[PDB]
Amino acid sequence: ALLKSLSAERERWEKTSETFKNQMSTIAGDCLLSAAFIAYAGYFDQQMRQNLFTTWSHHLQQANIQFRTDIARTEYLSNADERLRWQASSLPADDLCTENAIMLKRFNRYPLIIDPSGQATEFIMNEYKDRKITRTSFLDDAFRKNLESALRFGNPLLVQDVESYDPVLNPVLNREVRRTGGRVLITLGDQDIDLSPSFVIFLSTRDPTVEFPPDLCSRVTFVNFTVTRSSLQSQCLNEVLKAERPDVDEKRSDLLKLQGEFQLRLRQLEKSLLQALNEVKGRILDDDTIITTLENLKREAAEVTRKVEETDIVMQEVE
Amino acid sequence: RDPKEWIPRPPEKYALSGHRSPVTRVIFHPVFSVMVSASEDATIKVWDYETGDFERTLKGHTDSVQDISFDHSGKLLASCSADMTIKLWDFQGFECIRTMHGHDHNVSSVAIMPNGDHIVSASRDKTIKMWEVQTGYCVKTFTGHREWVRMVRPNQDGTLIASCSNDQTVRVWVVATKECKAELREHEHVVECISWAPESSYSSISEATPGPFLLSGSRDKTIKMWDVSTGMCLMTLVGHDNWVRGVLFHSGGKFILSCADDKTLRVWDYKNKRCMKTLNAHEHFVTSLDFHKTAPYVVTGSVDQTVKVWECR
Amino acid sequence: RDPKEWIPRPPEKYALSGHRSPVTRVIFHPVFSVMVSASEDATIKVWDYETGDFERTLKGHTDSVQDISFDHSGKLLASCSADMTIKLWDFQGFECIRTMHGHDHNVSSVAIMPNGDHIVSASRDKTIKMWEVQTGYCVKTFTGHREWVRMVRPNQDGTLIASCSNDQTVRVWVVATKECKAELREHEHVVECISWAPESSYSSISEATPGPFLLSGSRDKTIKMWDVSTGMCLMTLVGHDNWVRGVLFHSGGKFILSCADDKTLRVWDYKNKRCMKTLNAHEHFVTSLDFHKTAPYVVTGSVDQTVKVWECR
Amino acid sequence: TQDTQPHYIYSPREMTRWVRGIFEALRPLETLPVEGLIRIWAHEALRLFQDRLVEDEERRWTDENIDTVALKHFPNIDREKAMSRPILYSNWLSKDYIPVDQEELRDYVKARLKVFYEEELDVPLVLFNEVLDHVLRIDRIFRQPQGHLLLIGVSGAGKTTLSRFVAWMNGLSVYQIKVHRKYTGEDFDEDLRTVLRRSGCKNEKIAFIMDESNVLDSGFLERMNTLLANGEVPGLFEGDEYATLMTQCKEGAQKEGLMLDSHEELYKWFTSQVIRNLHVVFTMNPSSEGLKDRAATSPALFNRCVLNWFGDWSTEALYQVGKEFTSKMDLEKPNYIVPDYMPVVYDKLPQPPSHREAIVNSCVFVHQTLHQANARLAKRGGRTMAITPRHYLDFINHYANLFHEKRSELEEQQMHLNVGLRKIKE
Numbered sequence A: 001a002l003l004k005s006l007s008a009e010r011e012r013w014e015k016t017s018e019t020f021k022n023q024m025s026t027i028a029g030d031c032l033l034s035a036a037f038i039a040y041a042g043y044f045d046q047q048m049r050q051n052l053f054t055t056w057s058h059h060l061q062q063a064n065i066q067f068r069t070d071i072a073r074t075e076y077l078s079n080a081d082e083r084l085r086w087q088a089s090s091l092p093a094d095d096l097c098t099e100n101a102i103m104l105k106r107f108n109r110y111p112l113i114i115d116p117s118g119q120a121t122e123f124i125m126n127e128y129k130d131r132k133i134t135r136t137s138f139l140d141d142a143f144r145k146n147l148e149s150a151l152r153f154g155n156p157l158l159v160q161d162v163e164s165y166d167p168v169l170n171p172v173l174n175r176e177v178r179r180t181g182g183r184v185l186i187t188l189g190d191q192d193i194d195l196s197p198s199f200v201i202f203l204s205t206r207d208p209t210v211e212f213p214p215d216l217c218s219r220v221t222f223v224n225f226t227v228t229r230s231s232l233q234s235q236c237l238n239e240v241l242k243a244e245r246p247d248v249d250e251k252r253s254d255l256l257k258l259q260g261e262f263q264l265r266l267r268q269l270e271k272s273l274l275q276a277l278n279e280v281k282g283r284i285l286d287d288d289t290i291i292t293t294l295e296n297l298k299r300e301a302a303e304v305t306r307k308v309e310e311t312d313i314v315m316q317e318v319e
Numbered sequence B, C: 001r002d003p004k005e006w007i008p009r010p011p012e013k014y015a016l017s018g019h020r021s022p023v024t025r026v027i028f029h030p031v032f033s034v035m036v037s038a039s040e041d042a043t044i045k046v047w048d049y050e051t052g053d054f055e056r057t058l059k060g061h062t063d064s065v066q067d068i069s070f071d072h073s074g075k076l077l078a079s080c081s082a083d084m085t086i087k088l089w090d091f092q093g094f095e096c097i098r099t100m101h102g103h104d105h106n107v108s109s110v111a112i113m114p115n116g117d118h119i120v121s122a123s124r125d126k127t128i129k130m131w132e133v134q135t136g137y138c139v140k141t142f143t144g145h146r147e148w149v150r151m152v153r154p155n156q157d158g159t160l161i162a163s164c165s166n167d168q169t170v171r172v173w174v175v176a177t178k179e180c181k182a183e184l185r186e187h188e189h190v191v192e193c194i195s196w197a198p199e200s201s202y203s204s205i206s207e208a209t210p211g212p213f214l215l216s217g218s219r220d221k222t223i224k225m226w227d228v229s230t231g232m233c234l235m236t237l238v239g240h241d242n243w244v245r246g247v248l249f250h251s252g253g254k255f256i257l258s259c260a261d262d263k264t265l266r267v268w269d270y271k272n273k274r275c276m277k278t279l280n281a282h283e284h285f286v287t288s289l290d291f292h293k294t295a296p297y298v299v300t301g302s303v304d305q306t307v308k309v310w311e312c313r
Numbered sequence D: 001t002q003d004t005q006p007h008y009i010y011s012p013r014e015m016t017r018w019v020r021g022i023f024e025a026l027r028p029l030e031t032l033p034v035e036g037l038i039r040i041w042a043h044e045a046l047r048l049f050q051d052r053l054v055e056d057e058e059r060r061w062t063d064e065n066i067d068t069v070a071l072k073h074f075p076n077i078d079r080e081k082a083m084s085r086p087i088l089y090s091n092w093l094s095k096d097y098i099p100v101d102q103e104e105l106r107d108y109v110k111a112r113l114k115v116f117y118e119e120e121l122d123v124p125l126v127l128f129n130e131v132l133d134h135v136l137r138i139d140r141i142f143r144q145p146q147g148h149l150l151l152i153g154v155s156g157a158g159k160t161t162l163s164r165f166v167a168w169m170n171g172l173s174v175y176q177i178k179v180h181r182k183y184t185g186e187d188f189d190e191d192l193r194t195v196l197r198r199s200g201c202k203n204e205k206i207a208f209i210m211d212e213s214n215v216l217d218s219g220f221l222e223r224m225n226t227l228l229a230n231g232e233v234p235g236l237f238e239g240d241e242y243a244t245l246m247t248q249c250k251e252g253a254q255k256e257g258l259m260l261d262s263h264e265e266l267y268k269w270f271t272s273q274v275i276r277n278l279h280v281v282f283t284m285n286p287s288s289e290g291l292k293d294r295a296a297t298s299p300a301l302f303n304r305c306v307l308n309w310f311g312d313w314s315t316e317a318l319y320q321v322g323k324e325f326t327s328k329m330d331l332e333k334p335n336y337i338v339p340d341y342m343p344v345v346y347d348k349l350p351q352p353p354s355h356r357e358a359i360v361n362s363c364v365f366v367h368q369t370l371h372q373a374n375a376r377l378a379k380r381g382g383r384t385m386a387i388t389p390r391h392y393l394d395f396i397n398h399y400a401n402l403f404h405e406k407r408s409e410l411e412e413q414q415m416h417l418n419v420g421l422r423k424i425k426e
């Protein structure tokens, strides 16, 4: 019974073991494309982002460097759990905002978000809620004191109104940091301020048509929250369902949440089973914890079987 | 031979290595034959120069130890590292005794006067703190520099201390009057190393041209002899191709030993104004040197994580 | 004391724990006061033997690493595992350098002869490949073994290469002419480990009964020393009660250190051929040992997930 | 000529600078052959007639002209010994101004940067031939009295960092005005009087680093014009500040030993000290209109200042920085097949290129095609945002981070899977 239950995992584990040798060779090209996208394609819109990615892919193909061409440039960088957390924290479900959240999570220079819609501001507020984030503006009188407090205390900060840029942030954004042994010290204006390692700053914009000086363009990373055809189509379709077919819309939302939870629990199954069978520390035939793993596997086989009817009812609702 | 004519000769006697980081300072032990080195990995390794073998490793610091110094008896060792700590060690047990805190920034050097009851230290907080060894307390703090102080050093009787700092000045401070005696500024670039005249060289400098005489080497590839009393330089010695990091006298009181960042060790005679020998020390920058009072041995630390022993012939 | 009589004494100096899996091979660094250990959980942990503190781990392998090797420069790390690959690591950045392929079976031994230009690799595929350092490409290939090659070790001059396999023979080869200069069939069981006689041991073996000489330890209840000039067994060491696993020579070239599966660290001699000190090491079987050339430290590697260091007096 | 670029003005001032450059290059050297004389003539010629140029074609024309003029006027000469590729001169490796080679210069600069990271700026730097040439040019300007600089280059190219490194290593003290909002001409004049007091009365070297973005009014540029041209700003010290300056200047003259009274000779000595001690480095971005505007509104910036055109990083610079940053990571495939189309974007690429060479060339292509895409988007009609070498450094750092992260994840998952299959086989 154990082997019959675990053959379903063996038949794919051996396949992935064989695939790993090929997957070792695509790492360089795939990471090259991913890094170029995540450091270069921030300000541009969807069409220009796709044009740049196509140009880079064509050059890698012409240079005989193998890259995984059957993966999504956002699925390669994002995990399912962090995608679920972002979708919970008011992020739009389109690939553009998913890439923007990828760049916000994996930033190297401090990002400059441009959200005319105001979605990125509330997304950042919801995401950095456990850490005490504080909203402030460059035009606010209590900006220097708030920046000093955030720098001293290691609290994330979001600065709106970057059009009126206040140039005291040049050492912070350039990371001109003096290391006092193990201590970290940075100058700011007329004072030397202890820079805590767990400090991040986001600069915000509510106007797409703002011209920035090249020094700021070098110092910050642009994250453009534009609007795309697929996103607007999905938003309008959801609003039409909410207004006209409320029962259909609410059961669609409930089924989408249930499908997400079911996929999360299936991934939890896979991780738990792999880590439990990894650390048996002996013969699997001579233990009862293996029987506990078998019971977990059969219960989760039952739930992954019951996911199919949810898929069917989602299919009828979407058609 | 005669300690008057002790001069190192190529090649080195031993090539001692084992540090994981560049070596900052090397000094000799006065009583028992120990050469102890300080490095950038918080390891103060103890070596034996008589037979050229590794002896022991003393790890008490958490960041790069900068300078080490002894007392009149040689049984007490002090060290200073980038983690704002001064540590006093013994050699009867090779055990750390008392840690010393109170400086704001990187402590740059420490020194113990021959009376042995007090220890001075210069740091990056532009101050020299007057400590005491008995209870680990700061007696008072010298103040008056403008920038980071490179190292501090007392005279023979422990009443005049001098210090070199990044502001192109070398200030002599009186331990008695607690006031700067004669601050002189003549080097164009940062001064890095200083030294004092020994008891058996006043006649030598007087013939080459009382006292007291103060040495000072800087990063402008020059070495200057200064008289503390007159507040004026005697002369400027040139010849180094890069930054000078250490200057020291000789047992006979007639020679000047100095190492620089030009990957050479140079020993000079100041009577006839010129360099007399240029010894290729390392393959990288030479950080420091020390000269044995009673033995013909010279130790020179460096950045390439090696300590070399030269025999004075 | 003199290093000619450095035997480990009970109890152990440091008991280092932290390995999840059996430990395979343990070696000492040439210049740094640090040492690495290879275990069965696809990790290479590094420990400071002087103070017994954990430094870091090196995880870049996907299967159990079997053997590790240094060079004379002490900057490049070799490691062979069961994942059909060998991996190079640098000691200044502590990162992977090159992933190499070419063996379709488990690789059990790896070493670098002191020129620092190429690598040997003994694997289960009845062959030994010659791979390069600066490029990572196969240039030459040994052929002639017909069973699993267990351990490969290059001679100190590097002109002679020695390999022992599971076919009751220890076939030594020539690196240049690609020819097995001495093959013999006298072992009764599988030979496990080999070692090379130093220059100090050359004269000792010559006066015991010129050179070079060789030693092999085999599962046939016998440990014997080989000679390449005559191609004959010069002596046989008997007295261990179980399967032998690791054996090595002393720094002074006069003593012998061995470990077996009876949880013993039995030191012997060639003049008298009896064990003057049998010492218990672990609770489980023992894999590998290492004695420092310039330090009195013996490290014990065993499958009991624990590595111990012993002090020689 | 001046119609090609506004700063392309030539005068016998450059011949005088050439003559004196050769003079202090031959002053303490005391033993030189004609090969060395031609070499220093060529080096000063390059430093005076090539720094202000914009286009690599013009730079190649200058190099060819130096070679052919030296050949024409100096027959039966050793061309290879006289002129070569690096032609670098330095005074860091020796007390005298002697020629140096790139390898030893790079080793020394890397060691000095290791020393420099601890003291002021703990930001890593990558070395290449343009950086070596730039630090030597900035050092050469900083050594001479009244040495002022005008660095023309895109933002994020490292102008102020190279200036800070050279200033630190030459004993200069770096000063920046720390501009912010509501920063007015009164605050600028207070900063100017503080730096002038420090440079004249206190007798210290100051590298007054300032930027075009730090200019907020025409009074800023007027004061900078007067200070650059004359070494003094009349009307800056008024009221009790004039009396304070006179007291401090008399104290400084007493401290340095010179006996001074009255006010006229004291102020003249203060002007001489400011001339001998204060260095101004001005950094802006290249512009067709802005450069002409600065030439009109401040002739001192184009007369009394030595102009260096850093510009954008070249493809050779991008290739070398990418290769040096991607050297610690594993990138070599032994079974690599070179494509026969050979898309190459960096000339003098090794042939056949290996895998790491090919992908660093690919990174250079990625930067180049972003340049082209930005130009196309600007020409279409939409708004554009300037691209900087900071973006290339960000891209290469993201490449390193993503490579290490993905490799670690893949190896961990493969190891877990292998142990799981071994246990199920058991």
Ligand SMILES: Nc1ncnc2c1ncn2[C@@H]1O[C@H](COP(=O)(O)OP(=O)(O)O)[C@@H](O)[C@H]1O
Pocket (backbone or CB within 6 Å): A174, A215, D123, D124, D125, D126, D127, D131, D154, D155, D156, D157, D158, D159, D160, D161, D162, D283, D390, D393
């Ligand atoms: N040669 C180089 N190698 C590596 N990094 C560099 C180099 N030059 C510049 N940088 C990086 O680029 C940044 C440039 O900052 P800065 O000099 O203030 O910009 P600007 O050149 O516009 O003044 C620095 O923070 C530095 O980290």
